[PDB]
Structure 1
């Protein structure tokens, strides 16, 4: 059997039947991840403009739009073993520009920001409670990086009881390889990989 045949027989890759209460999660489009002056950053310019379109529509339709950022207090750095492996993350300190949401996302004062300490937007955060509290059934995940925080957020979203959509053109990464690998795993096991055009049309449809 080919890999495609193996995954098919294993029952992977089924489509998600989308719900009627969407929410947008924008994962770590902070300057630390989007401004190339910083060692941890990637080129996310196109991805942020696509994400802005999605968020602008969702916000106007009164669907939840939630941004995430990784930020640390100095005393937390030696306490968290993730920062031993991923030591570049220690630069993401409260009060620094690195932790601020990139303005290219079109973030507005109303928009809730959730601060987290790991990869997943759900881990050690209030995110699940906000989604459950707004009766969310379907999440659209965007952000940086595809192979890191985005993939981790996607796994947690489906595990938490939410259907997951991922517009590939809204996900940025440091390299094509890990980007493609995570989108494959997501499409097979965790959510539907699609594009912003689909998302936009879909959001208009559920509002209608």
Structure 2
């Protein structure tokens, strides 16, 4: 693991406005640990609220993500084979719904996805492109799933990702911190929410 600093990894990603905020799948099925798990997801959702309000106070473009399949499993995919309970994430299923504490407002965009990433076959890139977004704070679940996937795509799409370490949670803490490492060492700025805001 010394190879990372030798070969020049983990360089700081300087921060640049305009800012935006992406919250990825903080949805009833991911908050409640009976369905799609809880390690530090419950905690992450709640801390995120400060950011969200911070977002709305500064006039930040904000985007929320939801995994949504079609009711007749029309768009059932390779993903929903590997993790079968994702098919159950239908448009009206309470389980697919954003959690009351992060409920969307005003001109904030809600993106429906059938993949891990909030960019993949969505209009997220162009929405942020259009709004001239340079740096993008990310929050959500899962750290080792949709978050990271969404985070690497933010990067590739041309956005300076800033991962809120205390605003992403997983059902599993080991994966949680390894994916923070990967991301810290390769794909974005990685700091807690009070730090980000400042």
TM range (shorter): over 0.9
Q: SS of the residue aligned with 1:91?
A: coil
Q: Distance in 1 between matches of 2:101 and 2:166?
A: 15
CA gap of 1:19–1:83, structure 2 versus 1, over 3 A, is: same
Alpha-carbon distance, 1:10 to partner: 1.9
Q: CA RMSD in A?
A: 1.5
Residue 43 (structure 2) aligned to one of 43, 46, 49: 46
1:74 partner SS: coil
Aligned to 1:168: 165
Mapped contact 1:120–1:156 kept (Cα < 8 A): yes
Question: Which residue, 191, 196, 200 being the options, matches 2:188?
Answer: 191
TM-score, normalised via structure 2 length? 0.94
Residue 65 of structure 1 is matched in structure 2 by: 62
Q: Which residue of 2 aligns with 1:115?
A: 112
Matches within 5 A, 1:87-166: 87-166=84-163
- Aligned-pair CA distance for 1:61: 1.1
Report the alpha carbon displacement of residue 110 of structure 1 after superposing the two structures with TM: 4.1
The Cα of 1:46 is off from its aligned counterpart by 2.1
Match of 2:12?
15
Q: Shift of the alpha carbon at 1:45?
A: 2.7
**Structure with a larger share of its residues in helix:** 1
Deviation, 1:17, is 1.1
> In the TM superposition, what whole-angstrom CA distance separates every residue of 1:119-177 from its partner, at most 9, and x where no partner exists?
00100001001110000000111000100000001000000101111111101101111
Per the alignment, in what secondary structure is the counterpart of residue 91 of structure 2? coil
For these two proteins, the number of residue pairs brought into alignment is 197
User: What is the rounded CA distance, in whole Å, between the counterparts of 1:86 and 1:130 in structure 2?
Assistant: 29
Aligned partners of 1:64 and 1:95: how far apart in 2?
25
3-state DSSP class of the match of 1:151?
A: helix
CA contact (8 A) 1:121 1:149 kept: yes
CA distance in 2, matches of 1:83, 1:77: 12
The gaps in structure 1 that reach 5 residues or longer are 202-208
2:31 aligns to what?
Answer: 34
Tell me the CA shift for residue 106 of structure 1.
4.7
Deviates more, 1:41-50 or 1:177-186: 41-50
Q: Supply the distance in 2 between the matched residues of 1:69 and 1:165 (Cα, whole angstroms).
A: 20
